[PDB]
Structure formats: structure tokens, C-alpha cells
Amino acid sequence: ITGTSTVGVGRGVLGDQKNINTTYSTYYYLQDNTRGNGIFTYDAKYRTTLPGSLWADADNQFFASYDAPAVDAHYYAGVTYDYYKNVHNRLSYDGNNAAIRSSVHYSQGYNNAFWNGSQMVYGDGDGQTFIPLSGGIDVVAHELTHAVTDYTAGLIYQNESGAINEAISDIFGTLVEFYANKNPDWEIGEDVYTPGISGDSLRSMSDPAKYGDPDHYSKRYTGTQDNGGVHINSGIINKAAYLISQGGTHYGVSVVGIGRDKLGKIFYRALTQYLTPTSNFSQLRAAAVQSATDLYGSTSQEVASVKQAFDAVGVK
Ligand SMILES: c1cnc2c(c1)ccc1cccnc12
Ligand SMILES: c1cnc2c(c1)ccc1cccnc12
Numbered sequence: 098i099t100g101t102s103t104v105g106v107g108r109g110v111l112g113d114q115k116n117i118n119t120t121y122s123t124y125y126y127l128q129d130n131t132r133g134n135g136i137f138t139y140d141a142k143y144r145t146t147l148p149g150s151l152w153a154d155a156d157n158q159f160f161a162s163y164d165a166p167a168v169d170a171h172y173y174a175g176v177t178y179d180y181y182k183n184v185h186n187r188l189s190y191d192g193n194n195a196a197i198r199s200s201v202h203y204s205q206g207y208n209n210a211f212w213n214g215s216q217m218v219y220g221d222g223d224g225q226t227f228i229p230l231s232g233g234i235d236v237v238a239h240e241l242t243h244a245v246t247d248y249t250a251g252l253i254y255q256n257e258s259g260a261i262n263e264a265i266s267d268i269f270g271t272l273v274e275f276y277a278n279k280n281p282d283w284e285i286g287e288d289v290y291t292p293g294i295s296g297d298s299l300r301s302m303s304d305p306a307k308y309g310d311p312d313h314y315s316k317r318y319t320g321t322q323d324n325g326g327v328h329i330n331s332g333i334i335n336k337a338a339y340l341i342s343q344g345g346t347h348y349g350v351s352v353v354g355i356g357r358d359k360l361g362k363i364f365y366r367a368l369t370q371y372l373t374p375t376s377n378f379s380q381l382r383a384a385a386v387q388s389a390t391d392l393y394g395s396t397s398q399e400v401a402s403v404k405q406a407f408d409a410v411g412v413k
């Protein structure tokens with residue numbers, strides 16, 4: 098909507114106070130004009146018709162419990178936009194400042210969040226398995242990263258390309274969590290998964306097997322469930338990225354860590370310059386090694402650590 102840029106305040110899903118970029122025109126809208134072609138957040142009103150109505154408050158104050166998911170979808174979309182722009186010189190998900198649109202309160206008790214091809218969509222969770230899924234900065238960045246993938250490599254959401262698609266979302270979700278720097282970790286979804294059980298999460302990148310996900314190619318799921326295990330086999334690639342960043346010994350293979358920034362630079366380069374819709378795990382190995390060479394040289398530690406990490410998870 099046309100109006101003047103303002104700054105509201107409200108509380109997120111975890112009860113934390115934050116400032117939000119709004120637009121005033123009779124009401125104050127969750128429309129952030131400070132970032133590209135804007136960030137817009139909508140109310141789906143417990144229905145599945147999208148996007149619903151642009152989010153408004155009469156007083157620029159967003160402290161109602163009903164507001165909480167809208168505040169976090171809006172604010173964490175802005176963090177994610179800041180990460181891609183400041184770190185990778187990428188302007189929104191398409192590289193041309195596309196408007197970021199999010200809908201919250203999607204359906205009734207819906208334990209999921211997704212990129213629908215045009216926008217982000219967040220359930221409120223059933224209150225037991227999940228609380229409103231926009232409460233997790235890694236969840237928000239994971240979903241927006243599907244948009245980045247779809248506009249770049251275009252990795253098909255099935256089998257090994259789909260498992261890489263998921264792993265890129267987990268990797269960049271985790272690097273955005275670290276960029277915001279609010280008690281970051283290598284787990285996925287800890288802020289919104291099983292509210293009343295301490296220190297569990299959807300997935301672990303440091304120890305995928307902690308939640309039954311494979312951490313070696315030999316252990317990969319080959320059946321048809323989960324589009325050929327896109328959320329399962331992601332563990333193999335998540336473990337490789339963890340090892341590249343943080344180092345370790347895994348099935349007796351030792352990896353010297355090169356840190357999060359170089360992990361991000363290498364996988365960002367692989368995603369945007371080398372991966373294709375049909376890339377399999379071995380092709381990801383090749384893309385990452387080349388990305389590391391491009392950036393650091395063919396005899397660099399950085400290239401050595403990428404090779405070590407893929408060897409450790411049995412990906413040649
Ligand atoms: C209308 C109102 N405010 C804005 C725009 C359009 C566009 C960009 C922008 C950047 C920073 C702050 N305000 C605006
Ligand atoms: C700090 C804390 N609570 C408030 C304000 C500022 C301003 C207005 C208001 C209106 C109703 C309830 N609480 C507040």
C-alpha cells in the first residue's frame with residue numbers, strides 16, 4: 098500500500114520485544130519499505146486461502162498474542178534479506194529485490210511452514226508438536242532459502258537433488274541463525290518444536306542420527322516416502338557441511354574446520370554457479386570442490402577440508 102515508512106513495536110512468539118518496519122495509511126501495516134521491493138506480512142485468519150489480508154494495527158503496536166507469529170515472520174524475513182544482501186551481495190530471493198510475502202495463521206493447528214512458489218506460509222502448530230513456526234529464525238530462513246534455490250540451481254524436490262535442496266535450506270537457515278547471533282546452534286527448529294520438551298529439535302546437522310537421520314551415504318533411504326527421503330538423506334549433506342565448518346572425525350575420517358563464513362561462501366557459490374536441477378550428491382561434491390578452488394586455490398586447505406568432509410560421509 099502507498100503511505101509513509103514508520104517503526105512499530107511488538108512481541109514475537111517467544112515473548113521477546115522487537116521493532117518492526119511498518120507503513121502508515123489510516124492503519125499501520127506490516128509492510129517494510131526499507132528492504133528491496135518491500136517485506137509484506139499477511140493474516141490467513143485460520144483458513145487456507147492465500148495470501149489473506151495485509152496485516153494492520155490501528156496504533157503501530159503488535160503485542161496481542163494473535164500478533165506474535167506476524168511480528169516474527171515480518172522481522173525474521175528482514176533478517177534473512179539482510180543476510181543474503183550483506184553476506185552474499187544477493188538482493189532478495191530472485192537477486193532483483195523481489196517483494197517478500199508471508200502469510201501467518203494458515204489453517205487450524207497446522208504443524209508446518211512452506212514456500213508455496215510465490216510466498217512463505219506459516220502454521221500456528223497444534224501447541225504440542227509445534228508453536229507458531231515463524232518463531233524460529235532458522236525455520237524462516239530455511240523456507241526463504243527454498244525460494245533462493247528455486248530461482249538458482251532449481252534442484253528438483255525428489256531423491257538426491259531434493260535432499261541437497263533440503264540441506265541447502267538447513268545450512269543457510271543455520272547460517273542466518275548465526276548471523277542474527279541469538280544463542281545460535283546446528284539444530285533445526287529448536288525454538289518452535291515440542292514446546293514442553295527441553296533441548297530436542299526437528300533435525301541436527303552436528304549429529305543427524307540423534308533424530309534417526311543418516312550421517313553416511315551407505316545408510317541413505319532409497320524408498321518412496323518423503324519424496325525419496327528429501328528430509329532424511331539431507332542428514333548426509335548437513336553432516337558434511339557441519340564438518341567443513343566446525344571440523345571433526347567421522348567414521349575415522351578427520352576434517353579440519355574452515356569456519357561458517359567459508360562454508361557459506363563455498364555452498365553459496367556452488368548453489369548459484371554449479372548446481373543444476375538434477376545434481377546428485379557426487380555432483381554436489383564436485384560443485385563444492387570447484388567452488389572452493391575458485392575461491393581459495395586448488396591446493397588450499399579449504400579444498401582439502403571439502404574433500405575430507407565428503408569422504409567422511411561416503412560421497413565420492
Ligand atoms: C515509500 C516510502 N518509504 C520508502 C519507500 C517507498 C521506498 C524505499 C524506502 C527505503 C527506506 C525508507 N523508506 C522507503
Ligand atoms: C508500555 C507498556 N504498555 C503500554 C504502553 C507502553 C503504551 C500503551 C499501552 C496501551 C495499553 C496497554 N499497554 C500499553
Ligand SMILES: c1cnc2c(c1)ccc1cccnc12
Binds near residue numbers: 106114158160
Ligand atoms: C513495551 C512497549 N509497549 C508495550 C509493551 C512493552 C507491552 C504491552 C503493550 C500493550 C499495548 C501497547 N504497548 C505495549
Ligand SMILES: c1cnc2c(c1)ccc1cccnc12
Binds near residue numbers: 145204205206207
Ligand atoms: C494444506 C492445508 N492445511 C493442512 C494441510 C495441507 C495438511 C495437513 C494439515 C493438518 C492440520 C491443519 N491443516 C493441514
Ligand SMILES: c1cnc2c(c1)ccc1cccnc12
Binds near residue numbers: 147148198215216
Ligand atoms: C502473494 C504472493 N505473491 C504476490 C502477492 C501476494 C501480491 C502481489 C504480488 C505482486 C507480484 C508478485 N507476487 C505478488
Ligand SMILES: c1cnc2c(c1)ccc1cccnc12
Binds near residue numbers: 313315316348
Ligand atoms: C554400510 C557399509 N559400509 C559402511 C557403513 C555402512 C557405514 C559407515 C562406513 C564407514 C566406512 C566404511 N564403510 C562404512
Ligand SMILES: [Ca+2]
Binds near residue numbers: 235274
Ligand atoms: Ca537452530
Ligand SMILES: [Ca+2]
Binds near residue numbers: 289292294295297298
Ligand atoms: Ca522442544
